[PDB]
Nucleic acid binder design. Structure first.
Lengths: 109, 108
DNA sequence: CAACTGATACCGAGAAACC
DNA sequence: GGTTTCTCGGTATCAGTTG
């Protein structure tokens, strides 16, 4: 019934979203971009693409029918990451105060 | 069946918001509020979930710890899973203060 | 006031569980 | 064979903070 682990793994492996990059060869720690939507370094298309992808994969957002709202997509992906036991962030490696802000996550068996 | 239990609950008039929509006593409203933290009293009908927990013995008053959330869970699942109740989803009102959803009892 | 956030409440859909 | 309750994997809100 789980659909987040495989989806995220395929998303990183696709190499489609810049920033979504494996940090080791063992496929168990990965970086995920995390930029504020209000800042000037923010690009609506690139930085909000993964959250929108998760939103429309699970069928929450339907392009053309629903009014878009990237903040809620970000919150969906965030809450799914905190809640699911398959991912846990390494908060010491997650630098959220640089020109690029990212988050480091680690996968369990 | 919870059909007769809930019919008696609406008929009792004890629960605010638990009221029939018609004279035939077939369609009714049930309040549906989101709780706070320990704030389960904003829910106009938390006593209904308490009463369901007491009826099936899922909570012994003074012997078990109160858990309003799973009481509400139990009530909602038993409602939408029962063939005796159909939701009038085109009538339910979750977007308003004093929020409620409308159900219809079916004879069989 | 947008955007964001951890913690808690919530939800549907089976899978037991019970009568 | 027929009515509820238990699990699970996420989702949405509570009650705020950040910028």
């Amino acid at each position: 019934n789980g659909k987040l682990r495989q989806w995220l793994i395929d998303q990183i492996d696709s190499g489609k979203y810049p920033g979504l990059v494996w940090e080791n060869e063992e496929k168990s720690i990965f970086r995920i971009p995390w930029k504020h939507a209000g800042k000037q370094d923010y690009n609506r298309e690139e930085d909000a693409a993964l959250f929108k992808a998760w939103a429309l994969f699970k069928g929450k957002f339907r392009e053309g029918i629903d009014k878009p709202d990237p903040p809620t997509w970000k919150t969906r992906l965030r809450c799914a990451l905190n809640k699911s036991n398959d991912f846990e962030e390494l908060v010491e490696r997650s630098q959220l105060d640089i020109s690029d802000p990212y988050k480091v996550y680690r996968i369990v068996p």
